[PDB]
Ligand code: SF4
Ligand code: SF4
Ligand code: FCO
Ligand code: F3S
């Protein structure tokens with residue numbers, strides 16, 4: 001019973017956040033769950049099903065554990081829009097989250113509400129701190145759609161060894177979310193010089209000019225994409241596409257249309 | 262006698278299975294999807310160019326595929342012809358997705374229905390290694406299998422089983438019949454595949470910007486000029502070869518090995534109608550230009566393949582949580598949610614019920630492999646013949662849960678084999694100074710368009726109606742909607758509901774037989790409902 005216990009809940013989500021975790025390197029996911037933590041509940045991966053895993057969750061939340069929540073929590077009209085084993089997702093989270101030693105909201109859905117919370121939000125979905133704040137829950141927000149695997153795993157490690165990290169106003173760990181994408185973008189020199197691509201097929205785009213005039217929201221977006229990269233190889237702007245602000249609260253409505261400034 | 266499995270694990274999303282049992286076999290079934298998000302409602306009135314970004318978030322497991330379907334639908338309603346390099350790049354990215362998706366499904370989502378990890382501790386490792394060496398061309402040592410055994414041991418002795426907690430196979434289970442040596446090999450490969458999948462997703466990100474959730478497509482083509490550098494192309498190539506070798510040498514051989522011990526599953530989970538739109542086109546306006554072909558098979562009959570006709574699609578809601586009971590072709594799709602509780606008014610799911618000419622169909626790898634086999638697609642013919650000769654069965658064995666599982670492996674293989682072709686073409690184009698990725702386009706005053714994608718789970722289609730550069734209607738009909746949706750207004754069971762009838766249940770408290778059939782469809786509930 002040596003490794004720290006982690007309980008991982010899936011709510012209103014696309015599971016892209018769970019997948020991003022599988023992309024972790026140093027440690028790799030096998031090292032993470034065999035040597036670093038004990039993954040005591042995770043629906044995507046577990047061998048048993050039905051009643052057997054619900055019993056596992058019941059036992060696990062009696063101990064000292066960290067709670068990880070993926071996806072938004074539907075609260076519209078009583079919250080029946082999302083159910084697991086007959087239970088509304090709100091009730092599951094309300095039971096589990098307040099018991100944890102610490103809670104992590106992974107992905108923009110869990111932090112701020114995400115894609116389903118975009119207008120007109122038919123399920124009345126909200127984020128973790130908005131749903132469970134009255135119960136005393138104060139979650140660390142790992143934002144992104146999905147976040148960089150290093151921002152999640154780095155945060156778990158930090159929690160295990162150093163404690164609660166310092167957060168910004170939106171609950172994001174300052175050690176990862178302290179600067180905008182734009183501050184660290186290799187195309188910053190073009191932006192300041194006024195060197196923009198005006199269409200995706202122009203010589204300027206082929207030359208790698210700044211994408212600001214094609215919609216890029218880097219200047220308003222807090223994340224570490226340019227320096228960290230994804231999958232150790234790439235990131236949106238390097239691949240010629242504007243940033244769509246995926247780590248910002250309400251980005252779906254506040255930063256679209258995506259292809260205009 | 263009622264059995265309920267909720268939650269179904271090792272899938273994407275929120276599924277509940279209810280079954281009726283009599284004499285130890287399933288006599289009726291209900292496929293119940295229990296999360297609704299409403300992406301179609303959110304899309305209404307928005308900019309068509311935003312669509313691919315919202316719809317990609319339909320699902321993060323089959324990432325990319327909804328963005329593809331959306332730019333294909335908007336490309337289509339606008340009449341643009343994207344350049345050859347965009348077509349090549351998009352096909353390459355889809356190939357990498359097939360490679361990544363099917364690997365993770367077999368080992369990490371499906372295998373635990375067949376493999377008793379705990380029994381791996383009873384394996385003689387030297388004997389397991391020798392068996393490993395008979396199964397595949399790469400060399401395995403006794404020592405590496407001992408290490409794996411040691412890792413499983415630390416886990417069990419720690420008392421923290423983690424994801425193995427309360428497994429159906431703990432304390433023995435009459436339906437798990439693998440010899441300990443095979444359980445050990447499968448477990449070792451399960452762990453190895455966790456590292457291999459990381460390489461498949463990296464390959465994808467070289468063109469796709471990132472995984473999960475790519476960011477390189479636009480209406481009119483692609484944006485990723487950076488990936489056109491010899492260096493980037495060479496880096497894709499090297500990762501692509503490693504993942505391909507693992508698929509060829511470990512995945513496929515593991516699949517046949519395990520299947521061999523479950524030959525009886527060739528008589529379980531039979532279904533009848535199959536369809537696919539095909540994938541990997543040379544001509545974005547002609548399904549018959551596709552590397553894997555479009556086609557429709559009626560009632561298990563492989564001698565006659567009809568042409569896919571998208572005019573024949575209608576989605577039903579009589580048994581789902583939506584208003585009323587009318588069915589609509591997707592250009593006139595309606596999304597009006599209305600909850601009534603489990604079985605209230607007999608309604609039991611947030612999925613609509615897609616029907617083709619009024620009939621229920623199965624889509625996905627088996628369906629895709631059957632059509633290509635019927636049409637004499639040579640790569641598929643060779644792969645199928647190998648499975649069949651290896652298992653000692655005729656083609657009739659394919660119409661089953663065992664066949665559905667084998668077909669996923671074949672689909673993975675035929676895609677991986679072709680990827681090198683598209684890559685060489687892209688490279689040759691670039692070397693010759695042809696580096697176009699984008700074509701300019703303009704909105705018609707008013708138009709409609711449709712994008713067809715054969716995703717790893719099957720036939721995907723996005724349907725747009727736009728006026729003045731604004732979305733008037735945008736509907737998704739997705740492979741798991743077909744496979745796992747509920748009954749239609751005619752009361753016809755869906756592929757998965759029908760596949761479950763007849764299923765034998767050894768232990769009602771641990772009904773692994775239900776998981777085996779459900780997992781063979783590779784369910785995705787966020788996809789199915791959106
Ligand atoms: S934050 Fe994005 S990737 Fe994560 S669950 Fe939500 S939609 Fe999916
Ligand atoms: S491409 Fe985007 S993030 Fe980079 S400099 Fe331009 S506006 Fe800033
Ligand atoms: N593959 C996949 Fe996802 C489903 N079902 C889609 O489209
Ligand atoms: S879209 Fe998201 S992944 Fe980074 S580049 Fe922008 S924050």
Ligand SMILES: [O-][O-]
Pocket residue numbers: 273320322323718784785788
């Ligand atoms: O996963 O679709």
Ligand SMILES: [Mg+2]
Pocket residue numbers: 301613736737738739790791
């Ligand atoms: Mg739909």
Ligand code: NI
Pocket residue numbers: 273319320321322323324785787788
């Ligand atoms: Ni999916």
Ligand SMILES: [S]
Pocket residue numbers: 108109112113114115117248249250251252
């Ligand atoms: S959000």
Ligand SMILES: [S]
Pocket residue numbers: 259310478479480
């Ligand atoms: S676009």
